[PDB]
Amino acid sequence: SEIVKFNPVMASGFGAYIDHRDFLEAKTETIKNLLMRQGFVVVKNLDIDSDTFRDIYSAYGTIVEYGVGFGYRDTLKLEGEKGKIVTGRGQLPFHADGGLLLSQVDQVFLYAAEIKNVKFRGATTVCDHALACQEMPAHLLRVLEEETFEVRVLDGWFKVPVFTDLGWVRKMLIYFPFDEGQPASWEPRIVGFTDHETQAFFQELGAFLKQPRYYYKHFWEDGDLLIMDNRRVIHEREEFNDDDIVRRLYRGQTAD
Amino acid sequence: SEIVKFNPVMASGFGAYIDHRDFLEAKTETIKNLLMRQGFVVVKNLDIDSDTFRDIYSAYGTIVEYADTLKLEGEKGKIVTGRGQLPFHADGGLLLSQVDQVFLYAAEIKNVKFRGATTVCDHALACQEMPAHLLRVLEEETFEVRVLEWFKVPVFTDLGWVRKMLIYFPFDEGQPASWEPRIVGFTDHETQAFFQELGAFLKQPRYYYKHFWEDGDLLIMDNRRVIHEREEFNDDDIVRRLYRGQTADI
Amino acid sequence: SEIVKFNPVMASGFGAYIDHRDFLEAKTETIKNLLMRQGFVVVKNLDIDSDTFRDIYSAYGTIVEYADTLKLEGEKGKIVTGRGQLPFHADGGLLLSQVDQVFLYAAEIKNVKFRGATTVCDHALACQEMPAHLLRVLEEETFEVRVLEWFKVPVFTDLGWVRKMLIYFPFDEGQPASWEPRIVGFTDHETQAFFQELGAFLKQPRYYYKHFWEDGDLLIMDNRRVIHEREEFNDDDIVRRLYRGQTADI
Amino acid sequence: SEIVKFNPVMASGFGAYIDHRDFLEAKTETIKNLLMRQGFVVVKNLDIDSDTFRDIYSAYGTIVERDTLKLEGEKGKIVTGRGQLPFHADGGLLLSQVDQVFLYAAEIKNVKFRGATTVCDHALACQEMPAHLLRVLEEETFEVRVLWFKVPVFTDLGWVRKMLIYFPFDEGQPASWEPRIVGFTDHETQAFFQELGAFLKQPRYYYKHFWEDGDLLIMDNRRVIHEREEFNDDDIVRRLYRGQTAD
Amino acid sequence: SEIVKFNPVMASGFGAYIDHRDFLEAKTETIKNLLMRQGFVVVKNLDIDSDTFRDIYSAYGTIVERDTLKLEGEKGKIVTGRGQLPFHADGGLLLSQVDQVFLYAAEIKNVKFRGATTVCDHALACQEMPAHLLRVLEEETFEVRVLWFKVPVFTDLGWVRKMLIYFPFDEGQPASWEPRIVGFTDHETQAFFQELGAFLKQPRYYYKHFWEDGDLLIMDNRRVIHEREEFNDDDIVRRLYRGQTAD
Amino acid sequence: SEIVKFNPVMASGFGAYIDHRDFLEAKTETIKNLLMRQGFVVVKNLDIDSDTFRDIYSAYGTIVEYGVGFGYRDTLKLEGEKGKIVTGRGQLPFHADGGLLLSQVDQVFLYAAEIKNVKFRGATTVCDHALACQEMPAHLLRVLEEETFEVRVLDGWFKVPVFTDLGWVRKMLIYFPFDEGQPASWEPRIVGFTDHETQAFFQELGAFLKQPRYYYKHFWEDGDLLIMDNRRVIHEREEFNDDDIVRRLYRGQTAD
C-alpha cells in the first residue's frame, strides 16, 4: 500500500493534481487506486511520446479498443479532423466512455501531444456525478433514477441504464444532446417525455452539473496528461471550431 | 401534542414528506401544527375521492369559498383554471380573504412529466439571506396590484412567528395574465428588473421545491409561510386535474 | 405591522440587539412579534426605574405573579433569588403557570465581569441539528421533576410555530438545588450522562448566548422559543440586582 | 441493479436507515452494494430468530468463524463481556479478512443510555482531520499485542483506504488488546490516541446506536470503524447475535 | 488606536455600515484603517456640502486630481455620463496611484433600481474562483486602450494583491476603454470576461449600492473593484461628488 | 510582482506550505508579502547552517536583537536548556513576540537544527487570530476589545494593548498564563476582573483559539523552517519535559 503526493483539484477535496516526477515514480496500482476516489488525475509537464503513453496506460488493465478486434486499435488520435464528430472539432456533450459488458471502460487517458492558438476554447471538462446526485433537487434525481433513457446513433433507439450500481459508486452512463449547431453523433430521448420536456430536463441538469462544486474545466497545454476513472465521473469536450487551433490529443482506454 | 413521522423535503430541513398511512392516522391538529414550521406537506399514493378530500381539508378550519372545492382541470380559455403559468403569489390577497392553509390533490395526471409543476418557496429563509437591496424594496416600497380577468398589497404582515408574505409576481411574456403588479415610484423598467432578479433569488434550490404531479399526490401549504407558483402546461395532450381546498381561522 | 431596527445576536441570525431609543419608540406589539422568531431581545443603556419597567412589561400580556415584579438581588440563603446556578429551564412549568415572555432588567451590577451570566439557548435549531440519540430521548421518554426548596413535565408542547420546551436540568455538583429531574426507566447513571451530553450540545456557540450583565441592560425572552440559565455568582463582593417580569396570553 | 429506499443517518448523508419491509424485500446484493458507500445500515422492528439471521448474512459472502457469535454480556470475558470495546475494525488480530459485520438485537432490557455500538465515518474524518493527526496514521508503525505485531493502518482498496486500528482501552476497562506506536513514548501514544478519539467522536463522523429488540446493524468493515461502550450494570440484558462475512 | 462601531455589509463579514454620528466622531485614521480590511464603508443620512466632503476626504492622504469630480450624468460623456462603467479599479489608465475613492450623493431623484455603484470583494473571489479563471488573471498579459498598453492584474502589496483590471463595456454602452488579452482571440477574451464577471457578481462577493441623498460610499481601491450600472433614463438626477486619495 | 507556488495549511485557506526549492528560489519580498496574508510559512527539508539561516532571515528587515545593542545578539538558540524558561523545556503559552515601539517584531523565523526522540510533544503552534476574533462569541471579543490587560515579569504590572490596528490586521499582543506546573516567566491579569474570572476567561478563549479552524500544530523535524508574521498570528510552544528529547531550534526576529 503505497502513497502518492497529490493536491485536490476541487474545493470539496475531489480530483488530484500530481507532480510529473511523483506520477512517473508511482506504481500503476497507486494511481489506479487513487482514481477510484479522486475521479480524475491531472499531471502537467510530462514530455512523452505515443509509445511511452501506451506503456503508461496499458499497465492499468486490458486495453479497450476503439470484422472484430486484435489489440491493434489501441491509441486514438483526436486531432480535430474536419468532417468528423468524435475526432472532430465540435462539442462532445456530457457522456461517459464505452458501454456495458465487454465494451466497458474503467479508465480513460488523454495526453496532449500538440496544443497551439487556443487558450479559452476546447476544454475537456469533468463532472463529479456522485456528489452532484447526492445534492441535486430530488425532481432532477427522480428522472435519472426512474425513467427510461434511450439513445440513437445519428428502432435505431436503444436503452442506456443511467445507473449501474458498483457499490462504491453508481457508475453513470448518459448521453446529453449536442448543442444546436454542433455536429451530433448521437441523440437522446426519455420514454414518455416529450421533446420539450427532454430538452428542458437536459438543460436544467446540465446547468446543475456544471456548477463549480462539481465541474472541472481543463484547458489544454503540451505535456498535460488527464486520467479519468470512467465510472466515477462523466465528461465533455467543449467546442474548438476555429481553424487556427491545433489540438492533438492521444486517447487510451482500459478495463478489468 | 402528538407527533407525525416525516422526512424533510429541502436540505435546509424545511418541508415535510409524510407517508400516506402516517398522514391518515395523524390528527388534523398534528399536521396543522407541523405546517406552520415546515411550510408544506407532501403526501404520495393517497387514494381518495373528492368527498373524502373535503372531509380532510375542512377539518383545518373554516372553508374559504370561491365564486367549496375548486376544480383546476386545465380549461382552454381561462387563467386560474387555465393551462398557463400562475407566477409567485400567496393565496387570498387579491379578492381580500384570509387564507391559512391551501390543499391540492391530484385526481388525474396523464402525459406530463416535466411541465405543470406547482412550486413552493421558503420566503422566510430567503428574506433572511437575500441581498439587502432586494429586501429593502420589499420592506420599504409600496407594492400595488390590478386585476386583469390599482390597490395596495402589503408585502409583509407580521404574525410574529412569520412575516406572512402577500405578493403577486408579473406573468412571464406570452402567458395570459390574471393580475399585473406595479411598484410606486418605480418605472416599468425598474419593476421588471426587480422582479426578474428577486424571482431568480427565490428559485434557487435552497429555497425552492418543484412538485411534479402524479395521481394520488396531496400537497398542503401553509399560506403564510410560503408563496407558490404554477408552471405552464400548455400542450393539449396533458390531463392535469387537481382539487383545491382553502382554509382559515379567525 | 411596524418594523423595529435590529441586529442579530447569533451568527445564525437568531437573537435581536435593539438600540435603546429604537426600543422605546417601538410599539409593544412590534417587539412582541419579533420575540417569537428571534427568541430574545437585548437592549443596553436603558435608564429606567422599577415602575417604568412594570409599565413596559405589563403591556405584553397578563402578569404572571409569584408568591408582580421579582427582585433577584443575590440573597445568601435562597435558591432562585440566591447566588448560585439555576440550570437550563424554561419558566413556569414547576408551579404550573403559562409564561410567554420573561423580562430581566439590571438595576445594579458591580464587581462582576465574567460570572453570573444569564444564558440563552436556541432550542428549535438545536433540536433540528442534534444527534438522533439525543433527540430520541427528548421526544419519547417520560421526564419527571421534584421540587426541593415527582411529576411529569412534557418536554415538547407543539404550538405549531415552535415546539415549546419545558425541561429542568440537574444542578451542577456543589450548587444548592431547587429541583431535581429524573427520566423514567433510566438509571441515575444514564440520566446524569444524558444531561451532561445534551447540556454540552446546547452550550455550543451556534445555539448559545451568554449575557454578562451591566447597569441598564434589558433582556427579554420568548419563553416558548428559548430555554435559559443563570450561571453561579457566589462571591460576596458581587452586587447583582435584577428586576424580573413575566407575561402570558390565554 | 435494484434500488432500496433509504434515509441517511448522518447530516453528511452517510449511513442508511432502511425500513424492515424494504430491507426484507431487497436483494442481498442491493444492500451489500449500498453498504460500500453508506458505511452502515440500520433496520428497526425486524422480528427474526438466529437461523433467519444466519440466512440473511451468509448470503453476503463467505462466513468468517462456529458461525454466529452470541455477545450476551458474560462476566469474566472481554469481547463477549460487559465493558468497553474501543475503536477498531474487525479481523486484524486474527489474520482473517472481514468485509461485513452484522449485529442483531435478540434481547435488550434495562438499558437506555449505555452499551451502544457506535460507528465512525473514517474516510470523511481522515479527509478533514488536522494534518498532524493524519501524518501519524499514514507514516508511523502501529503495533498491537493480544491480551507485538505490525497492523497497517491503511490498506488502499481504491474506493476506500480500509482502516485497521486498535484503540487503547480506557482505564478500568478490561483490555483484550493493547496498542503501541513505534518511536513514540507511552506519554505520546496516549496523547495521540486521546486526541484522535475525540476527533473521531465528533457528531459529523459518529453515530451511536442504542439497542432495542429487533434492531439490525450491518457495517461495512472496510468503510467504518466501531466501538462498543461499556454496560457494566448487572441489571442489563444485552444479547446480540453477531455475523461476519467476506470475499 | 480607536474603534468605530460598525456592522458588516456582506454575510462573509466584509464591508462596514457605519452610522453617521459614529462616522463623524471617528478619527480619519480609524476609518482609513478599517477600509483596508473591510474594503468599503457605507454611511447614510449624512448632510454635507462639497467643501465639508473635501475636508473629510483630504485628510486621508494626498488628493489625486481639479480636486472634486462632479459625476452629474452629463450627456455625450463617458465617466461623467449616464451609461455603464464596467468593473475596474481607479487610476490605472492614467498612471497615478489611487488608494481611497470617496463617493457622495448630493442629489438623487427618480431612480430606485438603476445607476448603482457596485462593489466586489476581489480577494475572497480570487481565493474561491475556479482555477481556470484564476490562471488567466495570474499568468496572462492584459492590455488596455483608452477610447495599447500593459496593465498588471495583480500587484502584491502583501496584505492584499491589488487588482487593476478594466472590463469590457456591454454592447450599447459607450466605451471609454477597451481591453484585450495577449494570445487570446476576440471570442476567447469575450468568453473569459463574461464568465469572470458572473463569478464576481455572486452575492457572496458583490454589494450593489442604490443611491439616496446623503449617502457616502468610501472604497479602498486596492482591496475592491467596482462598477457603475447604467442610468440612461432622462428623468433621473444622479449627482455625485467624487474624491480620490493616496499615499 | 513575483509569485511563489504554495499550498494552504488550513482548510480555510490560511498558511502556506512551500517546497524548499521554490522557497530558496524565491525573492525575500515574495515570501514577506505572502506572510502578511497567509500568517505563516512552513518549509521542510531545508538543510542549512546557522550562517545561511542568518542570511535568509536578515534580508527581511532590520534584525531585532534578543548595556544596549550592537547587532551581535541576532540568532537565538532555543536548545531546551535546564532551569530556563524561554530557552527551556516547558510550555510557552499564547503570545506574540517582541513589544511595541522599537522593540516591535514583524517576522519570526524558527529553524530546526536538531530534533531527536520527539514525535508528539514540543510543538510550536500557530493561531489565526483575525479569523478567530471575527468568529468568536461577542462575550469573548468584548473583553479583548474593552478591558485593560496587564502583565508582570516573574507596580511590576504593565499594560499590554491587545489590539494595535495596522489597518490590514489588528496586530495582537497578549500573554496567556502558563499552565499549572510549568515554569512561568510572565503572569497576566485583567483590571477589574478577579483571579477566578481571569482564569476562566483565559481557559475559555484558549479553548476557542485552539479549535482546528484557527490552530496549527507544528511537530518538529530536522530541516524544518517555520516563518511567522508576528502581527498576523500568535503562537505557543507546547511542553517537552522529557530528558531524552533533543530539541534545538534557531530563532530570528526582524522588523521594518
Ligand SMILES: O=C(O)CCC(=O)C(=O)O
Ligand atoms: O477530445 C476530448 O477532449 C475527449 C474526447 C472524448 O471524450 C472521447 O473520445 O470519448
Ligand SMILES: O=C(O)CCC(=O)C(=O)O
Ligand atoms: O394549479 C396549481 O398548480 C396551483 C393553482 C393555485 O395556486 C391556486 O389556485 O391558488
Ligand SMILES: O=C(O)CCC(=O)C(=O)O
Ligand atoms: O437571575 C437570572 O439570571 C435569571 C433567573 C431566572 O431565570 C428566573 O428567575 O426565572
Ligand SMILES: O=C(O)CCC(=O)C(=O)O
Ligand atoms: O458488542 C458489540 O457491540 C459488537 C462488538 C464487536 O465489534 C465485536 O464483537 O467484534
Ligand SMILES: O=C(O)CCC(=O)C(=O)O
Ligand atoms: O459614478 C460612479 O458610480 C463612480 C464611478 C467611478 O468609478 C469613477 O468615476 O471613477
Ligand SMILES: O=C(O)CCC(=O)C(=O)O
Ligand atoms: O521554542 C519555540 O517553539 C518558539 C519559542 C518562542 O516562542 C520564543 O522564543 O518567543
Ligand SMILES: [Fe+3]
Ligand atoms: Fe469521452
Ligand SMILES: [Fe+3]
Ligand atoms: Fe395559489
Ligand SMILES: [Fe+3]
Ligand atoms: Fe427562569
Ligand SMILES: [Fe+3]
Ligand atoms: Fe468489532
Ligand SMILES: [Fe+3]
Ligand atoms: Fe472608478
Ligand SMILES: [Fe+3]
Ligand atoms: Fe515567541
